[PDB]
């Protein structure tokens, strides 16, 4: 999923509960977990689609 034109977007809850920034980071075609217990949701988009 490293391939040029793939895109990654963390998805927040409509109640604002999932501050995904407090649970993971996403950069350099990597995922990283942080200091805290939780759940994150993410979309893999491609070519703006």
């Amino acid at each position: 999923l490293d391939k040029t034109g793939i895109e990654f977007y963390p998805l927040m809850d409509g109640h604002g509960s999932s501050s995904c920034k407090d649970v993971i980071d996403i950069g350099d075609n990597k995922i990283v977990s942080l200091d805290k217990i939780g759940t994150c949701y993410v979309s893999a988009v491609r070519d703006g689609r």
Binding site: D25, I26, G27, D28, K30, V32
Partner: protein, 145 residues
């Protein structure tokens, strides 16, 4: 109807892009053995606007060199500026990467190259008439001369 394109709103807004996406390197391609030149690292946005020097204190700046034995580098008292120094004659390839320490996202410059910078041998020759020879030479720019 015909001039309607030019009527701007005098209560002018501000626009802030939130996010370095390209890098320019401002430096000379030649330095003398034993002397120094400066390098300035210009980081730009997705929309080609430069960042101001006051934002570079928040950037993870990583320089890249192939031949540090011919051309050495240090960072200055400004995070945006580096000091280069030539050590022996040759050629060296240089670039710089900048990363976001909050998101791990990075951008890199173009590669550039920098040269570091003649005598005859023998200085005296003796021959007989009908004798032949070929002259030799040392030091300078043997890749440019």
């Amino acid at each position: 109807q015909k001039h309607q394109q030019q009527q701007q709103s005098n209560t002018s807004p501000s626009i802030v892009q939130i996010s370095v996406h390209s890098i320019e390197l401002d430096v000379q391609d030649m330095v003398q053995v034993g002397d120094s030149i400066n390098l300035i690292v210009k980081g730009f946005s997705q929309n080609g606007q430069q960042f101001d020097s006051t934002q570079y204190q928040y950037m993870n700046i990583i320089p890249h060199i192939d031949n540090p034995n011919v051309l050495s580098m240090t960072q200055s008292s400004d995070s945006q500026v580096f000091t280069l120094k030539g050590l022996d004659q040759g050629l060296v390839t240089l670039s710089v990467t900048i990363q976001n320490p909050k998101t791990s996202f990075s951008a890199t410059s173009k590669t550039i190259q920098i040269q570091v910078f003649f005598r005859v041998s023998p200085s005296v020759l003796h021959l007989v008439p009908g004798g032949h020879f070929q002259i030799h030479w040392t030091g300078g720019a043997p890749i440019r001369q």
